[PDB]
Amino acid sequence: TGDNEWHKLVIPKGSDWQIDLKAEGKLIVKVNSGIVEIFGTELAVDDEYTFQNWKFPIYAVEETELLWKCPDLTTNTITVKPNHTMKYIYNLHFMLEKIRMSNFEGPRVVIVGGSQTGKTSLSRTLCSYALKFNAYQPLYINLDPQQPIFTVPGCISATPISDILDAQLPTWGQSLTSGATLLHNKQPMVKNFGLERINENKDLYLECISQLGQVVGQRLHLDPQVRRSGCIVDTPSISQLDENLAELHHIIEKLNVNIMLVLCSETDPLWEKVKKTFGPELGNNNIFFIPKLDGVSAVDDVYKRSLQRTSIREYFYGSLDTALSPYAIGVDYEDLTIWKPSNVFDNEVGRVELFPVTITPSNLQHAIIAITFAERRADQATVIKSPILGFALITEVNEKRRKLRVLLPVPGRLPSKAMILTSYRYLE
Amino acid sequence: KNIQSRNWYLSDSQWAAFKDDEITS
Ligand SMILES: Nc1ncnc2c1ncn2[C@@H]1O[C@H](COP(=O)(O)OP(=O)(O)OP(=O)(O)O)[C@@H](O)[C@H]1O
Ligand SMILES: [Mg+2]
């Protein structure tokens, strides 16, 4: 039960085709008629879209006839289901549009909720919808270092959504390249957290948020288009933050948030907790609740690690329809200056500080490293505050010749800059 | 035969002053 031919499918108005591709599953979709969207991004008719290693809905705004090709699906297996909660997304979107249009500046919204309530899907959809009717450029702010969006994992980020997302990509789209592309790409501001979970170093996590908030403010001050559009701030699971929600307080202050969106039932203890804690600061009129979003499903860590791997590959080499050429170089041990953040595992208590790394295969082989703008000779306090230039991958550490093979996204020389060891590993 | 690559990111000061209309126009 496989097959490599095209198959016709009609999706009813208001239904999702729920797709779940696992690993090496490859799906091609071609729309014949109607309107379908992937997290608010409209598929063009007669154009082929290719998907891989992703779990996502294709939503029918109108009754849609399409053609699909995939050896790992059959007509008797595909899942099509009515979605009853889109109206909540529309109501919220058009309220926000009203603020972008009439208020002195655009709304700055934080989205909060439990594990897999649909915070990131809501964010993506609202960003897509913001482009559609009045050509806004909202800032998408990702505060979940486990979700790779426009960059590699381990980062928080701010990115203006200045043109359509790539409906093919779980990563939403890509950052700028040196050549010609089918879609206009994005220009993100990225801060390196570097660790696998925020509880490995809460202090450093909050440090990154403060650094992002400062440069986000500098952008909004200089950019009237983005300022009028506002910000969509996406957070990690609420269960990952502290009991008293003091991390949310910090996010709200550093990013100048004025609207809060909570994903939960009016009877979840979270609802009253949020009103009691943030109501005196934001005003209860500016705290909204969305019930369960339909279709949203739980993900395991196998699935999260799979999106992370794909995002690392994409950073260096591009995607299926955007082939990029990264650059491999050999360097000596003496050519590299590498630091490592404090963490609970290595240092028992995570602080805002870095320690020097001694070059070993066990330490560095297969590691993603952040490249800063700081001199090699820069002190630790300078390196901590230094903006991120990009990322590199150490594919081989030869102990006997005292040399490394390093992969760069940009062809040319190894940057003469201070670098920071990440917890992420990638084998080609 | 022609090739392209990923770009480095912009510094804080260059990103703050950057206009996405440069990308899209
Ligand atoms: N209508 C739908 N049908 C099928 N799958 C969906 C639908 N909406 C969202 N999903 C999928 O459900 C999964 C969980 O959604 P999402 O990642 O947005 O939740 P989240 O609250 O951000 O999760 P986390 O707490 O892990 O950050 C994702 O894989 C997403 O693509
Ligand atoms: Mg999420």
Experimental method for this entry?
Answer: X-ray
CB atoms under 10 Å from CB of A182, counted, come to 9
Judge whether B2 is closer than 8 Å to chain A, CB to CB. yes
Are both A1-85 and A326-428 of the same fold?
no
Please say whether the beta carbons of A424 and A367 come within 8 A.
Answer: yes
DSSP-derived letter for residue A200 is: G
**A250 is written with which tokens?**
């910090």
Residues with CB under 6 A from ligand 1: A 16, 18, 55-57, 83, 113, 115-121, 144, 237, 294-297, 299
A193-225: b (≥16 Cβ within 10 Å) or e: bbbbebebbbebbbbbbebbbebbebbbeebeb
Among chain A residues, the shortest Cα distance to B19 is held by A223
Class of domain A86-325: alpha beta
Distances, alpha carbon A71 to alpha carbons A1, A2, A4, A24, in Å: 8, 4, 6, 11
Judge whether B21 is closer than 8 Å to chain A, CB to CB. yes
CATH topology of domain A326-428: Elongation Factor Tu (Ef-tu); domain 3 (2.40.30)
Who among A178, A179, A219 is closest to B16 (CB)? Answer: A219
Judge whether B25 is closer than 8 Å to chain A, CB to CB. no
Ligand nearest to the CA of A112: 1
**A29 is written with which tokens?**
């979709």
Best probe of the B interface among A131, A155, A184, A189, by most B CBs < 10 A, is A189
Judge whether B24 is closer than 8 Å to chain A, CB to CB. yes
> What SS3 state is found at A384?
helix
Ligand 1 center to residue A77 CA distance, Å? 21
Please say whether the beta carbons of A374 and A386 come within 8 A.
Answer: yes
Domain boundaries defined on chain A: 1-85, 86-325, 326-428
Determine the Cα–Cα distance for residues A58 and A154; give it in Å rounded to an integer.
28
Resolution (A): 2.4
CA atoms within 13 A on the CB side of A80: 16
Please say whether the beta carbons of A311 and A153 come within 8 A.
Answer: yes
- Partners of A370 on chain B (C-beta within 8 Å) are none
Determine the Cα–Cα distance for residues A320 and A317; give it in Å rounded to an integer.
9
- CA of B19 vs chain A CAs: smallest distance (Å): 7
Q: Which residues contact A172 (CB under 8 A, 6 or more apart)?
A: A124, A140, A149, A150, A165, A166
Q: Work out the burial of residue A128: count CB atoms within 10 Å of its CB; fewer than 13 is exposed, 13-18 middle, 19 or more buried.
A: buried
CB atoms under 10 Å from CB of A75, counted, come to 11
Please say whether the beta carbons of A410 and A390 come within 8 A.
Answer: yes
CATH topology of domain A1-85: Jelly Rolls (2.60.120)
Alpha-helical regions (H) of A134-241:
202-222, 224-229
Best probe of the A interface among B2, B4, B5, by most A CBs < 10 A, is B5
Among chain B residues, the shortest Cα distance to A176 is held by B7
Determine the Cα–Cα distance for residues A285 and A42; give it in Å rounded to an integer.
32
